[PDB]
Design an enzyme around this catalytic site. Sequence first.
Site, short mmCIF file in Angstrom:
data_model
loop_
_atom_site.label_atom_id
_atom_site.label_comp_id
_atom_site.label_asym_id
_atom_site.label_seq_id
_atom_site.Cartn_x
_atom_site.Cartn_y
_atom_site.Cartn_z
CB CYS A 1 28.29 -28.57 -67.68
SG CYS A 1 26.76 -29.43 -68.13
NE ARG B 1 28.10 -24.83 -69.23
CZ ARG B 1 29.21 -23.76 -68.95
NH1 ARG B 1 29.10 -22.79 -68.51
NH2 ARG B 1 30.14 -23.91 -70.08
CD1 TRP C 1 21.36 -36.09 -72.26
CD2 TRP C 1 19.25 -35.54 -71.39
NE1 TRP C 1 20.78 -35.00 -73.02
CE2 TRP C 1 19.73 -34.56 -72.18
CE3 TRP C 1 18.15 -35.53 -70.41
CZ2 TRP C 1 18.88 -33.31 -72.35
CZ3 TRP C 1 17.69 -34.26 -70.48
CH2 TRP C 1 18.02 -33.24 -71.44
CD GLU D 1 29.19 -37.80 -70.05
OE1 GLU D 1 29.24 -37.86 -68.83
OE2 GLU D 1 28.19 -37.49 -70.39
C1 HEM Z 1 21.07 -32.95 -69.27
C2 HEM Z 1 22.24 -33.49 -70.07
C3 HEM Z 1 23.54 -33.19 -69.59
C4 HEM Z 1 24.52 -33.50 -70.43
C5 HEM Z 1 24.39 -34.05 -71.79
C6 HEM Z 1 25.93 -33.12 -69.76
C7 HEM Z 1 27.08 -33.22 -70.15
C8 HEM Z 1 28.29 -33.15 -69.56
C9 HEM Z 1 29.49 -33.88 -69.79
C10 HEM Z 1 29.86 -34.58 -70.98
C11 HEM Z 1 30.36 -33.23 -68.67
C12 HEM Z 1 31.67 -33.90 -68.80
C13 HEM Z 1 31.84 -34.95 -67.81
C14 HEM Z 1 33.17 -35.90 -67.75
O1 HEM Z 1 33.86 -35.81 -68.95
O2 HEM Z 1 33.22 -36.43 -66.88
C15 HEM Z 1 29.69 -32.66 -68.07
C16 HEM Z 1 30.23 -31.86 -66.67
C17 HEM Z 1 29.49 -31.20 -65.74
N1 HEM Z 1 28.21 -31.28 -65.63
FE1 HEM Z 1 27.01 -31.70 -67.29
N2 HEM Z 1 25.58 -32.53 -68.65
C18 HEM Z 1 24.05 -32.75 -68.46
C19 HEM Z 1 23.37 -32.17 -67.24
C20 HEM Z 1 24.07 -31.62 -66.17
C21 HEM Z 1 23.23 -31.31 -64.92
C22 HEM Z 1 21.74 -31.47 -64.86
C23 HEM Z 1 23.98 -30.56 -64.00
C24 HEM Z 1 23.92 -30.18 -62.56
C25 HEM Z 1 22.56 -29.81 -62.21
C26 HEM Z 1 25.54 -30.67 -64.61
C27 HEM Z 1 26.57 -30.41 -64.21
C28 HEM Z 1 27.71 -30.65 -64.50
C29 HEM Z 1 28.99 -30.33 -63.82
C30 HEM Z 1 29.08 -29.56 -62.38
C31 HEM Z 1 30.08 -31.05 -64.61
C32 HEM Z 1 31.82 -30.70 -64.36
C33 HEM Z 1 32.00 -32.02 -63.45
C34 HEM Z 1 33.34 -32.03 -62.93
O3 HEM Z 1 33.81 -31.04 -63.10
O4 HEM Z 1 33.76 -33.14 -62.72
N3 HEM Z 1 25.30 -31.48 -65.88
N4 HEM Z 1 28.50 -32.51 -68.33
C1 9OS Z 2 38.09 -34.35 -60.65
O1 9OS Z 2 37.73 -35.15 -61.72
C2 9OS Z 2 38.07 -36.37 -61.84
C3 9OS Z 2 39.20 -36.94 -61.07
C4 9OS Z 2 39.40 -38.43 -60.85
N1 9OS Z 2 38.77 -38.96 -61.62
C5 9OS Z 2 37.81 -38.80 -62.50
C6 9OS Z 2 37.35 -37.41 -62.56
C7 9OS Z 2 36.15 -37.02 -63.59
C8 9OS Z 2 35.09 -36.29 -62.68
C9 9OS Z 2 33.79 -36.99 -63.15
N2 9OS Z 2 32.66 -36.00 -63.77
C10 9OS Z 2 31.69 -36.82 -64.12
C11 9OS Z 2 30.47 -35.98 -64.51
C12 9OS Z 2 29.80 -34.80 -63.77
C13 9OS Z 2 28.67 -34.37 -64.36
C14 9OS Z 2 27.98 -34.82 -65.52
C15 9OS Z 2 26.76 -34.27 -65.72
C16 9OS Z 2 26.07 -34.99 -66.86
C17 9OS Z 2 26.65 -35.83 -67.46
N3 9OS Z 2 26.08 -36.37 -68.73
N4 9OS Z 2 27.86 -36.65 -67.28
C18 9OS Z 2 28.40 -35.86 -66.03
C19 9OS Z 2 29.90 -36.55 -65.65
#
Ligand code: HEM
Ligand code: 9OS
Lengths: 407, 411
Positions: free
Chosen positions: A106, A109, A278, A283
């Site tokens: 993430c 963070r 947000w 994305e």
């Molecule tokens: C507040 C603004 C936030 C932004 C701008 C942000 C940004 C991002 C981005 C760009 C990713 C990559 C997602 C992707 O490419 O699919 C990500 C992943 C992730 N975010 Fe954040 N996030 C935010 C809030 C949060 C919050 C509130 C949580 C949890 C309470 C969180 C937990 C996670 C987790 C666990 C991942 C990894 C997801 C995965 O492995 O599929 N995020 N975040």
């Molecule tokens: C295991 O990963 C995959 C496998 C297959 N397809 C798609 C995926 C991507 C997983 C999607 N994770 C997507 C995500 C998670 C947390 C977020 C928090 C904030 C934010 N702005 N975007 C998030 C976007």
Amino acid sequence: RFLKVKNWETDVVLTDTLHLKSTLETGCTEHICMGSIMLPTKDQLFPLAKEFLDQYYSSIKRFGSKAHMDRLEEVNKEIESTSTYQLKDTELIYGAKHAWRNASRCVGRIQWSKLQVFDARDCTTAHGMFNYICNHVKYATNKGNLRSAITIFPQRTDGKHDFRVWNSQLIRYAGYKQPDGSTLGDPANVQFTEICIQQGWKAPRGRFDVLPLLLQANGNDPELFQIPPELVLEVPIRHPKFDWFKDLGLKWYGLPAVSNMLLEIGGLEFSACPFSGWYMGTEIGVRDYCDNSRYNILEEVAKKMDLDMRKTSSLWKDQALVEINIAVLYSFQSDKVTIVDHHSATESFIKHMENEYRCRGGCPADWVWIVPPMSGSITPVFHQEMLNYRLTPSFEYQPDPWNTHVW
Amino acid sequence: RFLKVKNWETDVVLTDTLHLKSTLETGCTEHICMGSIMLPVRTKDQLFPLAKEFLDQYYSSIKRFGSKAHMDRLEEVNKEIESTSTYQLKDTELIYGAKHAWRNASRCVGRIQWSKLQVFDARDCTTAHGMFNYICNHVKYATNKGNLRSAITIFPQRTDGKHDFRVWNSQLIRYAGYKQPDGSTLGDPANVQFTEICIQQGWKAPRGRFDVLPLLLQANGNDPELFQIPPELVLEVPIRHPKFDWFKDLGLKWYGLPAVSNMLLEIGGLEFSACPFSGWYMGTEIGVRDYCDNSRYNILEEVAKKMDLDMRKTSSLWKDQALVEINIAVLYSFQSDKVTIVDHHSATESFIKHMENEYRCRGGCPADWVWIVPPMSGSITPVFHQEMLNYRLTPSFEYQPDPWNTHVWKG
Ligand code: HEM
Ligand SMILES: COc1ccncc1CCCNCc1ccc2ccc(N)nc2c1
Ligand code: HEM
Ligand SMILES: COc1ccncc1CCCNCc1ccc2ccc(N)nc2c1
Ligand SMILES: C[C@H](O)[C@H](O)[C@H]1CNc2nc(N)[nH]c(=O)c2N1
Ligand SMILES: C[C@H](O)[C@H](O)[C@H]1CNc2nc(N)[nH]c(=O)c2N1
Ligand SMILES: OC[C@@H](O)[C@@H](O)[C@H](O)[C@H](O)CO
Ligand SMILES: [Zn+2]
């Protein structure tokens, strides 16, 4: 055993001590790195409970206090009797915030401490889940001034009473395979949509149909609900220079709300824990719109721009890519819906990282995920060495419930 | 043990068995991934099994495994090792080894080309003047008036570590950098330190923005000597833009031949500390990294002003916009001058095909995703969506410390 990370643009070295506390496996070995792979009992419970309570009580400057020992004692007793244990509200909030803090993928963070935690452990039915989810959506959306939130449903018991949100995000667009052979809507969401239809959803077979919720309470069969249309904030996508862009019929939703992950705190498992922040512009503009197996609009945009799509070397794809991402950010800003561009976000993450190294001894980070999907090396995270390791509390992936579900 | 990799764009699944042949270490453990870390005198003891492992690979590749020629060679090498404490490779083995070091380079996106490599045997070289002649010949051959040909020149292997051949330049052709008293840098900031060494060693610096550095060459462990590459051998391309006529007035140019000269080549336990090699550029190396890194020429702002982009807020994506135009200009300029270059779309597409071919015919293709994915437009190239497995095979190209940090000065 004590590790240094270098930033190759600034020459700043940071020293990681935090990795020593890591507990879960990476998937890598000394002979093989799996860094780019997407998915690499009462006896088990108490040390986990202990490790958590120890870090919680350390956090409140009460380590080795009677209150600490008392709680440890209390939880141990409760595990022996009930085979599980219940987190105090303070512990649940701490745990949820730290799961986000620990999310090595993430980039957002720096916000981790400002998370609204909705305790939905009193929920018993899928109708209750729906109510809680609607409230989450409305609170988080906040008329476009987005606020990070998580809603936490009852923890796993024997595994045959799981709460699950079947949707991958609270708000997402349906996908339909055509006779024409193509895909209408979001190709990412074909299988889930089919499951909705089997369960009885009446699909409007459009391109941007907000999917219904498929909610499972207490291990019972999942049920369908439609999020009130007025709680779903969406953004028509237009370009500030290209008048024709609006004719593409593109829109996206304001609220990224992931609903399929598992929250682990102190060995307890929360299989239903939708959370939302947000968007970072890329994305939507790079991945959602420009991935080949998603909406895949590069070609269409390229044409309206009248680019030479003869040769790859004209970089017509790269040009269309930038313009699409300009439109996304422009559109959200114009409608006053919170969004962050990849420059601002990665710059924030570098500052967060420095904070964490300074005040915590490190920050687990997955470079493959942290570096944005466009313009990588002009963002500061590209030049930043990162160490990836797994800390708990954590958000984990879990199998899609339909492969699991004993109907 | 079989390992699967998945392409998330195509759902194609490949199976790796080649990682079983990996011997060297990655830096990672089951508790920590060091995948984004840039950088995570042998005894006859260890030498023979290394020679033997290599020779078995060589003889298998020529379908002569277990042959009398195979067995005789093993025997010959063992004797040479036990009597002289080292051994000499046959020309065939040297060529095989150099090509395989390239094939094995997990950070290289250009490996579809691996079997086409011109190997220049310079193991008879004894002096820095000799190295200079060999390097001039390499540059002229490889350049080929713009029709670039991959090549490697191999100088004598390490013996006791006190007689190393080294090329002190990081690349055979590179621009000087000068730190100014006001803290600003003139030319290439990446090369400030090496430039200072050259100056100290006697180089008369023109002190311009694109001065080709002299070669600083070390033969047989002696103090290094300065030579100037004949200017007529240095092919350069003035950078212009196909639609923007002011771009030429930025005064940019670059050299045609990327020729890395500070790596170490390991073949069968032997160490070749001087082994300059060259292919051709992928456009983003110049247009993204060399020109747009903040710590390099750093031209984003100037370009952005000339395009009159909104530079008041990052969310206008002015940097991204300028970055594309600059990269268009680099590709346009090289093609216009008929100098070999490949764009990041073509190169990554070719790499995917190479990788798939390698899985089928070799059982794997070690790859470093962190390096393979281009530094702009990552996810619109097919490598972004491809899972990769990184591991180390020999023969290999390795990093070595900069020689000014280790060299024992004779004076
Ligand atoms: C507040 C603004 C936030 C932004 C701008 C942000 C940004 C991002 C981005 C760009 C990713 C990559 C997602 C992707 O490419 O699919 C990500 C992943 C992730 N975010 Fe954040 N996030 C935010 C809030 C949060 C919050 C509130 C949580 C949890 C309470 C969180 C937990 C996670 C987790 C666990 C991942 C990894 C997801 C995965 O492995 O599929 N995020 N975040
Ligand atoms: C295991 O990963 C995959 C496998 C297959 N397809 C798609 C995926 C991507 C997983 C999607 N994770 C997507 C995500 C998670 C947390 C977020 C928090 C904030 C934010 N702005 N975007 C998030 C976007
Ligand atoms: C023929 C055209 C070639 C192309 C287009 C190409 C492309 C590239 C690129 C873009 C990189 C990343 C470099 C960086 O970001 O600093 C790279 C790395 C590398 N290349 Fe290739 N290359 C070519 C030929 C060769 C040859 C002929 C060799 C050796 C015989 C080679 C060996 C390597 C090695 C060892 C690396 C890793 C460098 C490091 O770790 O710093 N390449 N290549
Ligand atoms: C460990 O190396 C570094 C660490 C920090 N900064 C900079 C570096 C230098 C990395 C340079 N790699 C430079 C290279 C090597 C081989 C190539 C082959 C072909 C080609 N077109 N370009 C190459 C470019
Ligand atoms: C194969 C590779 O790991 C995969 O394409 C990754 C690359 N980096 C990513 N980075 C982010 N933020 N999100 C992703 O889905 C991916 N996908
Ligand atoms: C810290 C990080 O490993 C470093 O910036 C890497 C990232 N990926 C790279 N990829 C390539 N091709 N070349 C590089 O120099 C780098 N630098
Ligand atoms: O100024 C000297 C630098 O060019 C040199 O230290 C290189 O960065 C190094 O050899 C890595 O390529
Ligand atoms: Zn790893």
